[PDB]
Amino acid sequence: EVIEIKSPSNLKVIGTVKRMSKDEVRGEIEEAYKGFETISRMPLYKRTAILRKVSEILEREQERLARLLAMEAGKPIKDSRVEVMRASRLFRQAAEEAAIVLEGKNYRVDAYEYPPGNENRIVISTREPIGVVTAILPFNFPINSFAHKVAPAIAVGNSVVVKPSISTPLSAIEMKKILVEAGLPDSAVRIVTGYSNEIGDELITHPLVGLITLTGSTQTGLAIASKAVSLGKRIIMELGGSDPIIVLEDANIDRASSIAVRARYEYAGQNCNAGKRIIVREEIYDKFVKAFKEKVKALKVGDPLDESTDIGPVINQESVEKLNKALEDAQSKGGNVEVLNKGPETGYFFPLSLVTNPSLDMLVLKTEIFGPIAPIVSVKSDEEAINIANSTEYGLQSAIFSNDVNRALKIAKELKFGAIIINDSTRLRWDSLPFGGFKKTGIGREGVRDTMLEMTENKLIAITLL
Amino acid sequence: EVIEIKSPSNLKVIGTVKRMSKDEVRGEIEEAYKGFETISRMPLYKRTAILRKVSEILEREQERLARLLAMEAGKPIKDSRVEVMRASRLFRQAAEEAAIVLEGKNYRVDAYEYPPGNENRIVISTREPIGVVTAILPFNFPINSFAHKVAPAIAVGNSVVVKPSISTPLSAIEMKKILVEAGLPDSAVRIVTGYSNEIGDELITHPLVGLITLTGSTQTGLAIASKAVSLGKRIIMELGGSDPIIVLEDANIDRASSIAVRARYEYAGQNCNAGKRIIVREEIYDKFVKAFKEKVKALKVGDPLDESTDIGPVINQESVEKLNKALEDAQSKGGNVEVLNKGPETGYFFPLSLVTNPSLDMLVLKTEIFGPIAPIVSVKSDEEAINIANSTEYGLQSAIFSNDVNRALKIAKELKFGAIIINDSTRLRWDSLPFGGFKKTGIGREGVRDTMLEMTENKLIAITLL
Amino acid sequence: EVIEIKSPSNLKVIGTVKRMSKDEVRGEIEEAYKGFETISRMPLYKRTAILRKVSEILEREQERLARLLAMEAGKPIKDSRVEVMRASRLFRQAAEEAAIVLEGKNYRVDAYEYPPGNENRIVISTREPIGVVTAILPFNFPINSFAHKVAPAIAVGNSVVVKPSISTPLSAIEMKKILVEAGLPDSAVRIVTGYSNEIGDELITHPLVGLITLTGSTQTGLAIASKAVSLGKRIIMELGGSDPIIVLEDANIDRASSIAVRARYEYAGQNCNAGKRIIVREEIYDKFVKAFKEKVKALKVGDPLDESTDIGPVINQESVEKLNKALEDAQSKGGNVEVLNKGPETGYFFPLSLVTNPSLDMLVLKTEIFGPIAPIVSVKSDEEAINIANSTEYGLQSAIFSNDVNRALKIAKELKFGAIIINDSTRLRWDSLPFGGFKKTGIGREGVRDTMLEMTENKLIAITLL
Amino acid sequence: EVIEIKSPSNLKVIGTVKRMSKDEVRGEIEEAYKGFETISRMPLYKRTAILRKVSEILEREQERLARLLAMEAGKPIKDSRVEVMRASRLFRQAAEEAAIVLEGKNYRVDAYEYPPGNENRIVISTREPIGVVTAILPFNFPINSFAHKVAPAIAVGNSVVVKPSISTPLSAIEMKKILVEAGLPDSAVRIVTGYSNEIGDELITHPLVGLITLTGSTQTGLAIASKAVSLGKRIIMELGGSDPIIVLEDANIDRASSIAVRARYEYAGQNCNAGKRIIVREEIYDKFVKAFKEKVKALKVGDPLDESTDIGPVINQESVEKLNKALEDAQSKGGNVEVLNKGPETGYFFPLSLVTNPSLDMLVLKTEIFGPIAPIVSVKSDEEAINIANSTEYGLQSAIFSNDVNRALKIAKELKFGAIIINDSTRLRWDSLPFGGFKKTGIGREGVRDTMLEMTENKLIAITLL
Ligand SMILES: Nc1ncnc2c1ncn2[C@@H]1O[C@H](COP(=O)(O)OP(=O)(O)OC[C@H]2OC[C@H](O)[C@@H]2O)[C@@H](O)[C@H]1OP(=O)(O)O
Ligand SMILES: Nc1ncnc2c1ncn2[C@@H]1O[C@H](COP(=O)(O)OP(=O)(O)OC[C@H]2OC[C@H](O)[C@@H]2O)[C@@H](O)[C@H]1OP(=O)(O)O
Ligand SMILES: Nc1ncnc2c1ncn2[C@@H]1O[C@H](COP(=O)(O)OP(=O)(O)O)[C@@H](O)[C@H]1OP(=O)(O)O
Ligand SMILES: Nc1ncnc2c1ncn2[C@@H]1O[C@H](COP(=O)(O)OP(=O)(O)O)[C@@H](O)[C@H]1OP(=O)(O)O
Ligand code: NA
Ligand code: NA
Ligand code: NA
Ligand code: NA
């Protein structure tokens, strides 16, 4: 009847959520449809007024929401603060950008001979809401993935059924209360909690669901997307990354090693755009690896509520097990695994780990490692840096470190990624800008402007003047 | 081994095409991948010079391509000429608009606090080709659906594997020779012919296929889309419609009935945006229905190659049987089926037919009728017009006839369609503008501008200036 | 040494401002240049944070600023409230729209064969601030014209020297204090007060002034613009209107007469887009004129601080004199002048007045009447409605009243105005949208989006990759 | 009465043109107004078909038009061919881009509270032609400045009165016959020839002239602009530049000196964006200056019609005298004037000359030198490079040579220019892209896209739905 939510730090019970049946989730979708009929009939200015009010509340509750993220998600408080502050600015940017993002066209159809009589026509476009959006959240950004999916949906007039990860659902429940305090109709966003195997399918198959937006793994996402699309439903998918960091021989080693450490091990490596594969020109390999090792041993692994904590635990036992499979696989294939930093024995603390002499047939170079394992590969050439970088089924983001920007811009043309970052982190994202990638990183882009267009239908009106 | 192509007018043999095996189609996708590697490395001005040359060749070969359409597709020569002129114009519009449509951004990232240090960044976007496109064409616009899929793909640097309908593949083989004459590398577009059930699956599941664009039936499309998306491939779908024409009591009756007749019966009704359901205000019902019948009986049904033919045959026996079943279903459910006009008995001529007293349980009101059957419904109010109009699983285009545009524009707001046409045909399309709609009418939009965006990936480059 | 500001309602002294010398204004411009060096180096996000803070303060001070407008400008409190609330929303829209409005391009220069080698180039654009803006305000919107000129200038990084009308300078002084409270650097906006004949020229000719934005009369504006442009300075000019209201025989007479009364006599007619010339089809002339007369006699002319006041005085004796010249001119040429409504004898109350049988050689039909004089012209045809409407050197906005929107859209193609309003007021303006006109209405457009582009220089950066 | 056109190469008579009176130019503006009334009523697809035909004729007549440019303008045939190909491409780009550039908006007015009732409004924008354009052409690009002014004007529906430079009017008379051959009405473009001081003022002040677009000198332009704006006419101005080339210590010296030579001396230096001031880092000064001199002495100065000529004459005696005065001024102020290369003594050949040890008081550093005189300055730092670069009243384009793009991009931020070129020539222009700059370099931008917007008026239509 309820599910217990435990801190991955100390396994203490943080709160509980309803264990929903298929039937109760069917009811939440029918209620979200009525919420669509309400919110879609409100003028845009009242909807953006609600979004600006949510923005201000999120700033006022920053510290409370950050502590909650630290407890359920194991995200160090300093990183938890940043996520809540991004969600605040995202809700505001959705308010601010709606007028221009949703703006239609008056087409110059007299430019075209077909159909005949275009000189007597007015043809305009508008962006219409789709209806009910199913939003399936990842565990790792429970407040900011909420904002990415819900802020745009409200701006355009859609309702949302939100299914947070059962690992981190309490954030989503507190976000709903903030939406109601901001003046959002109770029916316009419905939180559903439960096990994926009981409530997953109804959220994807119900005839009243117009669209499914999902952040999660490639395996889980592509199956769900396939089902959604089979019933004529629209899909936005932000799936895995194995983002490479390329360090060229003319790199600033101090900067590149500092940013690599932070990019790989922030939130114990549980980022879609963490620096997951490190590719270093042989000329600087030993200097880079020594600087990297020093910086990883200097991090504080411990309680995420502590101000001095750099790194917390991974989310659960399932993740610990997957990460051990990965370290075993790598030792069994000639990899040099080194444990660099160990946290308390209280929960799901995973040792900050380095793999040297990795090979392309290892789990650490061919799958998404959502944990604090840094594989570092030596290369001889830019060409070999490019091939190893592209050698994954992923294509989210990639970083190049070089004092030679002309050279980095030329390598960037040959990297198959949705973003290339020159002299900065794979972790960089702008919540208003396109985010996403090529290949199996997902489908569409997610960001306030692109999400609003992906969440609306273009509608033309053509008048023939008589 | 070959497949015989027969005219639906007189059943005579027009030509043959290779019955390709799975292994031969595998070869074509491999060669198309080499075509991608070639075409993607040419500068855009060279690709656009190829597209302007195709445009000029299409204009020069117009009468020869029009006659071939008439013979394989049964499309009257007058409508065949219009189709080849549209494809001419589309190839040119892809050349002309590519510079502006593919234009990227220089983002004002210094407007945003996150990530910190945006005042020191340049973030630019470019549109990158996806790679190999699988284009699955419908029978009803063999040349213009070719143009809609191939011209944007060449503009953006994708290669294409083209599977025409086995009913109308001869057009596509003639389009390939025109591409080669225009200077396109032979590897850059590959025509596959054969049975949908022997070569369909390779074209959807081959690892080298990045995207599937398809025009066809809802059931066919959604199954293909489902499979493609399960493998991480992008999809553009233009599936059916059941476009309603709403005729209000204050319409111009002569104009509304003339356009409603052309809208339903053009190409024997085989158009995604045919006027498939006609909703008439009871005040003018008798006058409209009477004007409608006189004009249907004035249409000439006959041989597509005769200059005085208005209406040719339907495409094959399978269609005749689907269309009898819709007629029989209407008779049995209280519908009055009246035949108005009958062409020769020599192939797949289907009588131009009218159904009065239809009901929402009938096939002629709840499915796409891809043939010359016009159901006419009487309504008392605009509210009733809107509820019948919206009652389908489709959402392509709708028309409203009314001398009152103010009322037409308010009704427009409540119609769930990709386009609403005020005082003109459901048939209207602007080949550069979005075409498509809501619900199971498809995924995405198809037009020179929209197809180019859907056929490219956004790629960010972010420089942090040191 | 000081200039006294008097209420046009009761001539009571409301406040005083410095009588500035050429020398002191030279000093204000040199200080605004230093303000440019400061504000242009602040990141955009801090500038938009200042603009959002100004937005909130203007809401908090709405009633105080509205009373001040009522006292110095003679604007009834209810209209004064609306102006302050528009200035609030304008300062916010400038904050909200900057990121997207200022966004540059990444040009697809490989679309072009010239110059040769475009396949090896990156070409981007950015919007740069111009430097120091001279802003010359009208008397009639002292707070909202302030916002139109200052909010965009701050968003883009320009400094502003603001010269309010000597009729209404106290508003501008209170706006500066609100800018400082919001965190704007003291040097970034300088208020100058004085007589045009002492300080006018320095504000237009100083070498440090990059741009002049002016709302005012055509005669004053075109002289200033000529001087600015002679020294290579940019210009935005919002000058006069004589906006026509066209009432067709199928108009809603009740609505058209109500909106005409309000459009002509709001703020005693002192609006650039007041309904200044009324054009009525003869078939409804007597019904319209009787409805108009009734509604004008029912208005309350009196103290603008009173809640029940509809109409206040004109601004000064100079205006009273110009309006008498106009009424004398019209009586002397066969016009039927009728006084409909008289206010107190305390100040510059001008009688609400109607002229019937006007002719095209009268001041009331050929010049801007910035006072409560309504000329009404009878016409026989749409063609005569169009010729009389276009028969002025102005082209700001024009309104058509008709239940036939198809007909009004066709008349709209032949009206030489920057905006045509169908079934609504000439007074309509959207502060984010283009506002302005053809002919001698001015130069450029004024609105948050267009003003930001007019206040920035496009800058290209072209990199040839080596 | 006629004016003799003489070749600046050998002073021989190339042709004659009418010496038009004020009364004859009055007639031409009247006929152009009738041309506006005709061309503005044609649908856009017809006007664009005329522009694509002009493009094809220019390509066919390329060698004949190139030879005429060589003879009247003294422009070497190799550079003349490039000019006629650019104009060919520009006419085509005006045809191709008109549909998207002129596209209006459907504003989301329901995002705004003011005016009340925006939820019931449709507000659309269109681009309307202004009417008659006066195009005043410079001598140095007689055919491409024609294209830049006439092709956008025809695309948007304006008529044009074209006053070519009396030095190079024969090209424009040949362009008119091509327009007529393309199908343009004869009334739609009117060539005026005569003395600037007899017909200049009618072309600027006639009441039927809506806009003046001019390429020429700063002093000429600003006086004309001043007059036009005093009468309420719109203005586009492209006036001088003194583009600096900055060459950093880590530049490719061979490339920087080759491009710097071409940049300064192409067409004897008579380009708005010539490399007019060359700023070299003291570390490479001696090596650059030496490579520079060898390449200048390798250039062939001679007859424009010879295929091996690199550099022809300057345009007339007035130019030779302006250029001697700049030389004499430099000698007297401590400058070392070295002649490097001398063409024939047969017309207006001017020696290719170099000035070392220049000073900021010299004409060769504070004015536009429209001839083959290259001042080279030594600098110690980037800070000094930037201050010299920015020291002019001009702001057209600047170039930076550097293998370090990161440093090139940071310097780019501090240069006050309309475009900065990294590792390429100041000569670069993209005829579709903005061209122009800051300060007294002009008003507005000139390119297919920008010129079309500057040559149209925004017109809003706002419907309130009853
Ligand atoms: N069958 C089914 N039906 C419906 N919903 C389902 C289903 N299976 C899983 N889910 C939910 O999808 C979400 C993502 O889960 P997962 O793929 O494990 O991703 P993570 O949360 O681990 O995040 C990893 C990704 O985030 C960032 C990057 O994209 C990484 O690859 C989460 O809310 C899951 O619920 P559950 O309650 O958690 O099981
Ligand atoms: N020579 C000179 N130099 C500098 N500044 C000068 C000069 N002459 C006037 N002005 C100022 O221009 C502004 C507009 O004045 P005006 O043209 O009388 O317009 P109104 O204020 O009456 O507003 C009418 C217009 O507003 C709306 C519509 O566009 C109407 O036509 C005002 O601040 C004037 O100062 P001053 O102190 O007021 O004399
Ligand atoms: N399983 C499958 N795999 C691939 N293509 C398929 C397919 N089923 C159908 N198609 C193609 O899908 C396209 C559209 O068929 P359709 O029946 O959905 O629509 P239509 O009648 O409008 O052409 C055709 O090219 C069809 O091939 P055939 O016409 O030769 O049958
Ligand atoms: N007062 C005036 N009125 C109109 N046009 C004028 C003018 N003064 C100069 N022009 C024109 O302005 C154009 C540019 O002249 P310019 O000396 O400013 O520049 P350039 O040397 O680059 O051609 C020419 O067409 C010139 O006519 P002439 O070349 O026949 O002299
Ligand atoms: Na990746
Ligand atoms: Na439909
Ligand atoms: Na007007
Ligand atoms: Na310059």
Short mmCIF file of all heavy atoms in Angstrom, two decimals, chain C residues 399-411:
data_model
loop_
_atom_site.label_atom_id
_atom_site.label_comp_id
_atom_site.label_asym_id
_atom_site.label_seq_id
_atom_site.Cartn_x
_atom_site.Cartn_y
_atom_site.Cartn_z
N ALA C 399 -8.57 52.00 -38.30
CA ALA C 399 -9.52 50.97 -37.84
C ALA C 399 -10.66 50.85 -38.87
O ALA C 399 -10.98 51.88 -39.51
CB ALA C 399 -9.99 51.26 -36.44
N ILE C 400 -11.12 49.62 -39.10
CA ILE C 400 -12.33 49.30 -39.89
C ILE C 400 -13.34 48.57 -38.99
O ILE C 400 -12.98 47.55 -38.36
CB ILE C 400 -12.02 48.43 -41.12
CG1 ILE C 400 -10.82 48.97 -41.91
CG2 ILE C 400 -13.28 48.29 -41.97
CD1 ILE C 400 -10.10 47.87 -42.67
N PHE C 401 -14.57 49.08 -39.01
CA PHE C 401 -15.77 48.49 -38.35
C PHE C 401 -16.68 47.94 -39.44
O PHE C 401 -17.08 48.73 -40.31
CB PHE C 401 -16.45 49.52 -37.46
CG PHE C 401 -15.65 49.77 -36.21
CD1 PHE C 401 -14.63 50.72 -36.21
CD2 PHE C 401 -15.85 49.00 -35.09
CE1 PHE C 401 -13.86 50.91 -35.09
CE2 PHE C 401 -15.09 49.21 -33.95
CZ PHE C 401 -14.10 50.17 -33.95
N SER C 402 -16.90 46.63 -39.41
CA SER C 402 -17.73 45.85 -40.35
C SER C 402 -17.95 44.46 -39.74
O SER C 402 -17.02 43.95 -39.16
CB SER C 402 -17.07 45.77 -41.69
OG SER C 402 -17.78 44.90 -42.55
N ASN C 403 -19.14 43.90 -39.84
CA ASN C 403 -19.35 42.46 -39.50
C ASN C 403 -18.77 41.58 -40.62
O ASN C 403 -18.62 40.38 -40.36
CB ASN C 403 -20.82 42.13 -39.25
CG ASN C 403 -21.34 42.74 -37.96
OD1 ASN C 403 -20.58 43.17 -37.07
ND2 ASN C 403 -22.65 42.80 -37.86
N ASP C 404 -18.42 42.16 -41.78
CA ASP C 404 -17.86 41.41 -42.93
C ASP C 404 -16.31 41.48 -42.90
O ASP C 404 -15.74 42.44 -43.46
CB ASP C 404 -18.50 41.93 -44.21
CG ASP C 404 -18.13 41.17 -45.47
OD1 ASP C 404 -17.23 40.30 -45.41
OD2 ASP C 404 -18.75 41.47 -46.51
N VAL C 405 -15.63 40.49 -42.31
CA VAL C 405 -14.14 40.52 -42.12
C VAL C 405 -13.43 40.28 -43.47
O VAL C 405 -12.34 40.85 -43.68
CB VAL C 405 -13.68 39.52 -41.04
CG1 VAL C 405 -12.20 39.21 -41.17
CG2 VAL C 405 -13.99 40.09 -39.67
N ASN C 406 -14.02 39.48 -44.34
CA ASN C 406 -13.49 39.22 -45.70
C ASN C 406 -13.36 40.57 -46.43
O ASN C 406 -12.32 40.84 -47.03
CB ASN C 406 -14.38 38.22 -46.44
CG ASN C 406 -13.88 37.91 -47.83
OD1 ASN C 406 -13.08 37.00 -48.01
ND2 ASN C 406 -14.38 38.62 -48.82
N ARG C 407 -14.40 41.40 -46.33
CA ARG C 407 -14.44 42.76 -46.93
C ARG C 407 -13.42 43.67 -46.23
O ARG C 407 -12.75 44.45 -46.92
CB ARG C 407 -15.84 43.35 -46.80
CG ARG C 407 -16.02 44.72 -47.43
CD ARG C 407 -17.50 45.01 -47.44
NE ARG C 407 -17.85 46.40 -47.65
CZ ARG C 407 -18.99 46.96 -47.25
NH1 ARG C 407 -19.88 46.27 -46.55
NH2 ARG C 407 -19.21 48.24 -47.52
N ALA C 408 -13.32 43.62 -44.91
CA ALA C 408 -12.41 44.52 -44.18
C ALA C 408 -10.97 44.15 -44.53
O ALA C 408 -10.15 45.09 -44.69
CB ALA C 408 -12.67 44.51 -42.70
N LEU C 409 -10.66 42.86 -44.69
CA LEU C 409 -9.29 42.39 -45.03
C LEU C 409 -8.91 42.94 -46.42
O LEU C 409 -7.70 43.26 -46.63
CB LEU C 409 -9.23 40.86 -44.99
CG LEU C 409 -9.04 40.25 -43.60
CD1 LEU C 409 -9.13 38.72 -43.65
CD2 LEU C 409 -7.72 40.69 -42.98
N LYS C 410 -9.88 43.06 -47.33
CA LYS C 410 -9.63 43.55 -48.72
C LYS C 410 -9.39 45.06 -48.69
O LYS C 410 -8.50 45.51 -49.40
CB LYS C 410 -10.77 43.15 -49.66
CG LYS C 410 -10.95 41.63 -49.80
CD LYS C 410 -11.65 41.19 -51.05
CE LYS C 410 -13.14 41.45 -51.02
NZ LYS C 410 -13.80 40.99 -52.27
N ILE C 411 -10.17 45.82 -47.93
CA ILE C 411 -9.93 47.28 -47.72
C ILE C 411 -8.54 47.46 -47.07
O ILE C 411 -7.84 48.42 -47.45
CB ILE C 411 -11.06 47.90 -46.89
CG1 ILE C 411 -12.38 47.83 -47.66
CG2 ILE C 411 -10.73 49.32 -46.47
CD1 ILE C 411 -13.62 47.87 -46.81
#
